[PDB]
Design an enzyme around this catalytic site. Structure first.
Site, mmCIF file in Angstrom:
data_model
loop_
_atom_site.group_PDB
_atom_site.id
_atom_site.type_symbol
_atom_site.label_atom_id
_atom_site.label_comp_id
_atom_site.label_asym_id
_atom_site.label_seq_id
_atom_site.Cartn_x
_atom_site.Cartn_y
_atom_site.Cartn_z
ATOM 1 N N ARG A 1 -15.769 2.932 3.028
ATOM 2 C CA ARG A 1 -14.596 2.968 4.208
ATOM 3 C C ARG A 1 -14.647 2.603 5.514
ATOM 4 O O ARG A 1 -14.582 1.316 5.787
ATOM 5 C CB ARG A 1 -13.656 3.338 3.108
ATOM 6 C CG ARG A 1 -12.937 4.118 3.773
ATOM 7 C CD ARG A 1 -11.554 4.831 2.893
ATOM 8 N NE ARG A 1 -10.675 3.650 3.823
ATOM 9 C CZ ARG A 1 -9.333 4.643 3.304
ATOM 10 N NH1 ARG A 1 -8.906 4.729 2.153
ATOM 11 N NH2 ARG A 1 -8.269 2.565 3.690
ATOM 12 N N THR B 1 -8.130 -1.763 1.768
ATOM 13 C CA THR B 1 -7.785 -2.595 0.581
ATOM 14 C C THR B 1 -8.033 -4.536 0.608
ATOM 15 O O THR B 1 -8.251 -4.757 -0.051
ATOM 16 C CB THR B 1 -5.815 -2.570 0.509
ATOM 17 O OG1 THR B 1 -5.826 -1.398 1.268
ATOM 18 C CG2 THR B 1 -5.315 -3.401 -0.622
ATOM 19 N N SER C 1 -7.466 4.385 -0.501
ATOM 20 C CA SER C 1 -7.541 3.026 -1.412
ATOM 21 C C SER C 1 -8.690 2.313 -1.413
ATOM 22 O O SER C 1 -8.649 0.724 -1.914
ATOM 23 C CB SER C 1 -6.645 2.089 0.280
ATOM 24 O OG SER C 1 -5.428 2.802 0.427
ATOM 25 N N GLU D 1 -1.715 -8.707 1.303
ATOM 26 C CA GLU D 1 -1.416 -6.674 1.139
ATOM 27 C C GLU D 1 -0.288 -6.615 2.563
ATOM 28 O O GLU D 1 -0.534 -6.921 3.295
ATOM 29 C CB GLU D 1 -2.679 -5.566 2.251
ATOM 30 C CG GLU D 1 -2.078 -4.136 1.999
ATOM 31 C CD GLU D 1 -3.047 -3.331 2.484
ATOM 32 O OE1 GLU D 1 -3.841 -3.865 3.465
ATOM 33 O OE2 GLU D 1 -3.576 -2.701 2.293
ATOM 34 N N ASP E 1 0.945 -1.186 -0.047
ATOM 35 C CA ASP E 1 0.162 -0.060 0.036
ATOM 36 C C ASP E 1 0.797 0.850 0.051
ATOM 37 O O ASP E 1 1.490 1.351 1.110
ATOM 38 C CB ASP E 1 -0.585 0.167 1.517
ATOM 39 C CG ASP E 1 -1.766 0.501 0.990
ATOM 40 O OD1 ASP E 1 -2.070 2.458 1.369
ATOM 41 O OD2 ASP E 1 -3.924 0.669 1.002
ATOM 42 N N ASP F 1 -1.704 0.131 -4.429
ATOM 43 C CA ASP F 1 -3.038 0.767 -5.506
ATOM 44 C C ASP F 1 -2.549 2.433 -5.458
ATOM 45 O O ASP F 1 -3.492 2.821 -6.838
ATOM 46 C CB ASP F 1 -3.533 1.306 -4.197
ATOM 47 C CG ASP F 1 -2.913 1.735 -2.386
ATOM 48 O OD1 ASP F 1 -1.959 1.426 -2.620
ATOM 49 O OD2 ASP F 1 -4.010 1.801 -1.691
ATOM 50 N N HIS F 2 -1.740 3.325 -4.540
ATOM 51 C CA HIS F 2 -1.437 4.303 -5.365
ATOM 52 C C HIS F 2 -0.535 5.318 -5.097
ATOM 53 O O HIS F 2 0.710 4.486 -3.847
ATOM 54 C CB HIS F 2 -2.248 5.479 -4.865
ATOM 55 C CG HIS F 2 -2.442 5.037 -3.087
ATOM 56 N ND1 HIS F 2 -1.760 5.988 -2.224
ATOM 57 C CD2 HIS F 2 -3.314 4.091 -2.520
ATOM 58 C CE1 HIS F 2 -1.599 5.631 -1.273
ATOM 59 N NE2 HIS F 2 -3.335 4.797 -1.595
ATOM 60 N N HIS G 1 -1.353 11.280 -0.665
ATOM 61 C CA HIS G 1 -1.312 10.406 -0.760
ATOM 62 C C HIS G 1 -0.913 11.255 -2.123
ATOM 63 O O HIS G 1 -0.746 12.416 -2.555
ATOM 64 C CB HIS G 1 -2.742 9.378 -2.126
ATOM 65 C CG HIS G 1 -2.904 8.774 -0.919
ATOM 66 N ND1 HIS G 1 -4.162 7.702 -1.039
ATOM 67 C CD2 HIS G 1 -2.692 8.210 -0.160
ATOM 68 C CE1 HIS G 1 -4.488 7.179 -0.232
ATOM 69 N NE2 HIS G 1 -3.488 7.559 0.456
ATOM 70 N N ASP H 1 2.471 2.345 3.623
ATOM 71 C CA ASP H 1 1.341 3.629 3.068
ATOM 72 C C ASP H 1 0.715 3.805 5.175
ATOM 73 O O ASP H 1 1.526 5.621 4.938
ATOM 74 C CB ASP H 1 -0.375 2.860 3.317
ATOM 75 C CG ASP H 1 -1.103 4.203 3.087
ATOM 76 O OD1 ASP H 1 -1.887 5.244 1.997
ATOM 77 O OD2 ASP H 1 -2.364 4.927 3.534
ATOM 78 N N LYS H 2 0.812 3.383 5.839
ATOM 79 C CA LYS H 2 -0.248 3.769 6.455
ATOM 80 C C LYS H 2 1.125 4.765 7.761
ATOM 81 O O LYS H 2 1.122 6.078 7.950
ATOM 82 C CB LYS H 2 -0.175 2.873 7.893
ATOM 83 C CG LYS H 2 -1.075 3.012 7.796
ATOM 84 C CD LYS H 2 -2.306 1.381 8.998
ATOM 85 C CE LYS H 2 -3.377 0.184 7.369
ATOM 86 N NZ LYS H 2 -4.592 1.486 7.235
ATOM 87 N N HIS I 1 2.406 8.076 5.759
ATOM 88 C CA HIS I 1 1.149 9.213 6.613
ATOM 89 C C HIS I 1 1.879 9.584 7.401
ATOM 90 O O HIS I 1 2.138 11.032 7.758
ATOM 91 C CB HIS I 1 -0.174 8.564 6.837
ATOM 92 C CG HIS I 1 -1.265 8.346 5.491
ATOM 93 N ND1 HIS I 1 -0.909 9.281 4.573
ATOM 94 C CD2 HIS I 1 -1.244 7.729 4.682
ATOM 95 C CE1 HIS I 1 -2.350 8.840 3.559
ATOM 96 N NE2 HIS I 1 -2.153 7.992 3.654
ATOM 97 N N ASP J 1 -10.485 -2.580 6.602
ATOM 98 C CA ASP J 1 -9.076 -1.584 6.451
ATOM 99 C C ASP J 1 -9.576 -1.910 4.860
ATOM 100 O O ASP J 1 -9.706 -3.159 4.115
ATOM 101 C CB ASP J 1 -7.702 -1.656 6.337
ATOM 102 C CG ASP J 1 -7.313 -0.354 6.593
ATOM 103 O OD1 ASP J 1 -8.285 1.391 6.234
ATOM 104 O OD2 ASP J 1 -5.844 -0.186 6.020
#
Ligand code: MG
Ligand code: MG
Ligand code: ZN
Ligand code: ZN
Ligand code: ZN
Ligand code: ZN
Lengths: 449, 449
Positions: free
Chosen positions: A166, A155, A102, A322, A51, A369-370, A412, A327-328, A331, A153
């Site tokens: 979500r 994903t 996501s 995943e 992610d 994902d991005h 993102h 990602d987390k 951030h 989550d």
């Protein structure tokens, strides 16, 4: 005596300072590429998602953990590569929204339809669209859904749940945010309730917390979601030892592994980037997280047990894996947390590749994902965002910068990013493609429909 | 024989809001990929470079000019893709320096040796290494060098000069900055004098300013660089009229076009990004630069002529085309300028692909020297750097952010980025490779000994 080769070594071949020393290749690749092309059907599929793992993230993690001229034996090893787009849609207008979350991206690859940020398994009109897992299952394939995050989550939830937001993790939030989906309202249920109905053979991650909630209607009204899962015959495991004790997982006795209340612990510890962090503070060396555990399974372990269990299926299997916290931690502006989860995922990819290689009929895809915020900048950079200097494997300093947000979380980014694959049908990832093309690639590979 | 195709149309297939509507593929690529792999010798090589064009810059330009679901008929049409690394070295320590400048990366691909930031055609010990153009010439191939920057600039200069610092433009700066390269102190000369010695068949770009310098020594001392050029037989041209009138270009009649004092004019204008510019100001629509002329050849025109003169050589050719100002406009934090020069390159790439597709023995490579600052972020983003909202071809808003520096110019980033190729030996770009493999790949293709 055929067989599709994986990239055995693409590290710098010699002295990085001398002529030809930084070369990752040793001869012409043509022949090896040809050997990598097959249109035979795939028996199985392993989709590994980092992610927020864009090109930047991969590079920073390689530089740090393997050195600039290093090679990730898992991540960098796939022979067929391309770059894909992951834009989402504006719900009202139906025009592109250039930076996806996501939820919308996961929906894209698992359904083949573009949607709005925050949506899971529905389109802009909020119509439910069947997912690659449900489809694989329908066709009699074993199915796996493994993640380092909370199972609710976005994903992993994309594969088994269809909700307008979500956020509708369980009954409580669903009632209030997804009135349309709430069970007590005639709806299909919160994410956790649909996950339980979905009934994949093997599901492992965190998010044990939401299972403490009780259902507001139906057959299991008033019992906890955990009690529900037991009542429907799931095998529940909550540590490495009990997981590793599982012998089979199927439709009669589906596996459910709940390894933490929220997200599973991060592999590495370090401080957060900080303003002028690379000038005002010494360089950081990440350190293993003591809370990681011997009782807590690693991604590679979860991946490994899943392939084991799922491989019993004669028909084949679909498995999504995943590495959630890349990602987390991006951030959070935490370089060590971020990198450490990239190294974690690489270990998981090595395992998938070891299996695939010997099995011979498996498609293994690695992507994200991005894109995300982190950027590799010069050591003497003076940025208005967050920065940190790291001591890398080369013994040099690397500076990492997060400068796309003034508030709480780093964001993102919409850049196109790597997608690599290996196995039957791998060729469909080469060149430019869309995230939605992956759905069709997997469908076709598996011969679904 | 099934001779090699370019991706025909990788645009979104239909309505992006509907299932399969955003797909770029119309079927299985396996067969086409097979058809694309050839290890027969390359007769010609055209290398196109977008300075600072990482995946990020390509995506933004795409969203802008063609829409999220569009396709660049040039840039996106190369079927064989990978990601490559471009780290440089610390001069004193020889350890990797994670973020390169144009001098060091350009040296990498043109000589196959890593170097320190600022170096042109030398290694960390300051020793010279033959460049790819020098080797092609030695073999009797026609050679071309085209840039929209001043010819002295790092990217085009790396082909023809070997100086300890990129600043050593001509006589004056060399004396003071690269003493050991100064003519008077027995060196090989400033960049410009070295360019003159190199005698490429075709050289087109800006950079006239420095040609006004007078040599300090040698057989042309006291005389100007321009006067020397004429004395040596170069055919000068300083406008489009005169370029098209040129019919011949060879070793005893080399072409030298100086279309500007410094850099050639950028295609598009727009305001610079500003603090909270996406929040504070209206979305921007780029304006075509009214001062770009019918007198100043475009990159595609420059490329078109170059291809024509050069192809007369029976032996084959080597041509390097650089879309220079992507980088420069990125540094300036000007989305319109950055995007406009990517659209410009795309036009040059199409010209190259056209020729290649017909000729059938040409390797065309499109890539960048390094990644840059620009990121695509969410419309409501509150960021500490410079931001701007743009009106895309989709009729939607895209925000670009510049936040890796507080100082004068946005900085380069060290992320790996796309390399894409078409033709004989194109396979050596797939997967993970290093900027140094490129040299080796072009040298082996042409079979330069
Ligand atoms: Mg995730
Ligand atoms: Mg340049
Ligand atoms: Zn994500
Ligand atoms: Zn995120
Ligand atoms: Zn550059
Ligand atoms: Zn630059």
């Amino acid at each position: 005596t055929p067989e599709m080769p994986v990239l055995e070594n693409r590290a710098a071949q010699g002295n990085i300072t001398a002529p030809g020393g930084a070369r990752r290749l040793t001869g012409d690749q043509t022949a090896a590429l040809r050997n990598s092309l097959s249109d035979k059907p795939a028996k199985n599929i392993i989709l590994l998602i980092g992610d927020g793992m864009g090109d930047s993230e991969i590079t920073a993690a390689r530089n740090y953990a393997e050195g600039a001229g290093g090679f990730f034996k898992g991540i960098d090893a796939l022979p067929l590569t391309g770059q894909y787009t992951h834009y989402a849609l504006n719900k009202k207008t139906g025009k592109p929204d250039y930076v996806t979350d996501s939820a919308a991206s996961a929906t894209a690859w698992s359904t083949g339809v573009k949607t709005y940020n925050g949506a899971l398994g529905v389109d802009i009109h909020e119509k439910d669209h069947p997912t690659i897992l449900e489809m694989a299952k329908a066709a009699g394939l074993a199915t796996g859904n493994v993640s380092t995050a909370e199972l609710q989550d976005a994903t992993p939830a994309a594969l088994v749940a269809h909700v307008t937001s979500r956020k509708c993790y369980g009954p409580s939030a669903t009632s209030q945010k997804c009135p349309g989906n709430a069970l007590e309202k005639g709806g299909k249920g919160s994410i956790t309730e649909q996950l339980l109905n979905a009934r994949a053979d093997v599901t492992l991650g965190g998010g044990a917390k939401t299972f403490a909630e009780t259902a507001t209607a139906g057959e299991w009204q008033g019992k906890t979601l955990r009690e529900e899962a037991e009542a429907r015959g799931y095998q529940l495991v909550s540590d490495a030892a009990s997981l590793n004790s599982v012998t089979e997982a199927n439709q009669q006795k589906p596996l459910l592994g709940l390894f933490a209340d929220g997200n599973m612990p991060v592999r590495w510890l370090g401080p957060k980037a900080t303003y002028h962090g690379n000038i005002d503070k010494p360089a950081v060396t990440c350190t293993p997280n003591p809370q990681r555990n011997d009782s807590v399974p690693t991604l590679a372990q979860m991946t490994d047990k899943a392939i084991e269990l799922l491989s019993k299926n004669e028909k084949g299997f679909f498995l999504q894996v995943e590495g959630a916290s890349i990602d987390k931690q991006d951030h959070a502006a935490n370089p060590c947390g971020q990198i450490g989860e990239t190294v974690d995922l690489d270990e998981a990819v090595q395992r998938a590749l070891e299996f695939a290689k010997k099995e011979g009929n498996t498609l293994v895809i690695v992507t994200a994902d991005h894109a995300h915020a982190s950027q590799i900048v010069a050591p003497d950079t003076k940025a208005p965002g967050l920065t940190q200097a790291l001591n890398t494997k080369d013994g040099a300093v690397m500076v990492m910068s997060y400068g796309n947000s003034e508030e709480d979380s780093q964001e993102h980014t919409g850049s196109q990013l790597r997608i690599a694959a290996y196995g039957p049908h791998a060729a469909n990832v080469v060149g430019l493609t869309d995230q939605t093309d992956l759905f069709y690639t997997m469908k076709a590979a598996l011969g679904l429909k």
